[PDB]
């Protein structure tokens, strides 16, 4: 659900799309996430 969780009913959202939202909340456009989704996902998984 993402951030929708803390404001009314939780709303399902595709995970990659909530990440796009989160990227666009830090000034980086969503294009970065979709074009580099594989690298972003790999850095996430490695960090864990």
């Amino acid at each position: 659900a993402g951030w929708t969780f803390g404001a009314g009913a939780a709303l399902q959202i595709p995970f990659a799309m909530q990440m796009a939202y989160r990227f666009n909340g830090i000034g980086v456009t969503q294009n970065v996430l979709y074009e580099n989704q594989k690298q972003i996902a790999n850095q996430f998984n490695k960090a864990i």
Binding site: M17, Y21, T29, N31, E35
Partner: protein
């Protein structure tokens, strides 16, 4: 139903603000916190890159307001 981008004439169009959604008939762009569908035009989109890189890109049509 959603898509992260629209593939139109070989280019990927991302929503400028909000999310692309399908109402069962047509694709519209609307805001995440309140459904209010807008026509997807070149004003409501951000073009970046080709159609090969985005996962889940769809073959919709983006309207051009400059057409007489």
């Amino acid at each position: 139903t959603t898509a992260p981008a629209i593939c139109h004439e070989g280019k990927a169009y991302f929503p400028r603000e909000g999310v692309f959604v399908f109402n069962g008939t047509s694709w519209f762009i609307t805001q995440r916190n309140f459904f209010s569908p807008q026509i997807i035009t070149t004003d409501n989109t951000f073009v970046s890159g080709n159609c090969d890189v985005v996962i889940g890109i769809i073959n919709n049509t983006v309207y051009d307001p400059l057409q007489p």
